[PDB]
Design a protein around this ligand. Structure first.
Ligand SMILES: CN1CCN(c2ccc3[nH]c(-c4c(N)c5c(F)cccc5[nH]c4=O)nc3c2)CC1
Length: 255
């Protein structure tokens, strides 16, 4: 069952810091793809991840297309990642644009959390866009108190979400100016990040971030509970992202 007859590569989309990501078009049917390509130990570690994605079939999570070196064919999303969008446009996202992403993310998180799965790498570079204006998420008594805590556990996502929303408002996440070494300390030491210009955004945004970014995963809310927040409870149209995908395409056409 050799590949290359099935798919033909027709582009490169981004050498991240994990393999390289190329664009693939089906030889028979004509369909597009994203091909992630790698080449004992690691191989079985990747198979588990692949077989986890097959399971995670939902509107707002990339579809697994196949598995043939090591090829992984995932759905082409022709808007690309939101962080790439934000630079090509050289600006943040409008609150209504942020409202639509926050809500679609929450349905993806709430889905995953019912499957007992965490994402753990939620940032703007892992929120992809379709032309339709929709997102896809990508890729015992002698025990010491601190050992106990590190054995609710899926509230990690909910923190990354609120942090992703700041990334989208402001282009850059909080503490972007310090090196990765010092970040971890700043995270653990500092109070929950707020928006830089509280004046610029609605009272609902500020409060959503207030409750999303609780340092205590006990008192911190589920994807489910957050879906009833005013900030995302009234959101029925993907218009504002339909709008934003259009500009991005237009801006990209420039030469
Ligand atoms: C600079 N202009 C805007 C960004 N540009 C762009 C265009 C299409 C793109 N598709 C993907 C993509 C993934 N990166 C991807 C992944 F990383 C993991 C799993 C599935 C994926 N599917 C994709 O469809 N990125 C794109 C970027 C290049 C042109």
């Amino acid at each position: 069952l050799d590949p290359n007859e099935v798919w033909e590569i027709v582009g490169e989309l981004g050498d991240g810091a994990f393999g390289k990501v190329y664009k693939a078009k089906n030889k028979e049917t004509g369909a597009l793809a994203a091909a992630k390509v790698i080449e004992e130990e690691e191989l079985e570690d990747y198979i588990v991840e692949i077989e986890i994605l097959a399971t995670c079939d939902h509107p707002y999570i990339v579809k697994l297309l196949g598995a043939y070196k090591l090829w992984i064919m995932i759905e082409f999303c022709p808007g690309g990642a939101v962080d790439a969008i934000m630079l090509e446009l050289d600006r943040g996202l409008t609150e209504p644009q942020i409202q639509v992403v926050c809500r679609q993310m929450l349905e993806a998180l709430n889905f995953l959390h019912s499957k007992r799965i965490i994402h753990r790498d939620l940032k703007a570079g892992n929120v992809l866009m379709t032309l339709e204006g929709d997102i896809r998420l990508a890729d015992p008594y002698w025990m010491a108190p601190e050992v106990v805590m590190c054995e609710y556990d899926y509230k990690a996502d909910i923190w990354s979400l609120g942090i992703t929303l700041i990334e989208m408002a402001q282009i850059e996440p909080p503490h972007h100016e310090l090196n990765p070494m010092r970040v971890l300390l700043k995270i653990a030491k500092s109070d929950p990040p707020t928006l830089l210009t509280p004046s610029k955004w609605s009272v609902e945004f500020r409060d959503f971030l207030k409750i999303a970014l609780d340092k205590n995963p006990e008192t911190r809310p589920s994807a489910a509970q957050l879906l009833e927040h005013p900030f995302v409870s009234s959101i029925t149209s993907n218009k504002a992202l339909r709008e934003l995908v259009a500009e991005a395409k237009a801006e990209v056409m420039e030469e």
